[PDB]
């Protein structure tokens, strides 16, 4: 990921009143993945054949 000049200037301070970036800013990258799975029901109890 390549960031933006607005982000790099918001990370530094120097903002005036009611500007949002009046204080140094910290950022956290988060990634999530939605995937498939298989659930087998047998003999009344559940289990994961592939886990």
């Amino acid at each position: 990921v390549t960031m933006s000049p607005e982000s790099v200037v918001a990370a530094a301070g120097g903002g005036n009143n009611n500007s949002g970036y009046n204080e140094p800013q910290r950022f956290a990258l988060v990634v999530i993945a939605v995937n498939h799975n298989v659930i087998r029901i047998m003999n009344g109890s559940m289990g994961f054949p592939i886990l």
Partner: protein, 52 residues
């Protein structure tokens, strides 16, 4: 045809529930009770008799 990067054979595992929790169990063994001779045995006191 093929690729210049071998795909390693990752380990394959599966999860078995086996034993259940507590819902479809109850005691499931009727009410088995009863005990053998208790450690503190009670002595047999002498049996006295009372008459006029």
């Amino acid at each position: 045809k093929n690729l210049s990067k071998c795909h390693q054979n990752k380990l394959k595992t599966f999860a078995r529930t086996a034993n259940s929790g507590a819902n479809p169990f109850r005691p499931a063994t009727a009410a088995p009770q009863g005990l053998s001779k208790q450690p503190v045995r009670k002595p047999f006191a002498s049996a006295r008799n009372a008459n006029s």
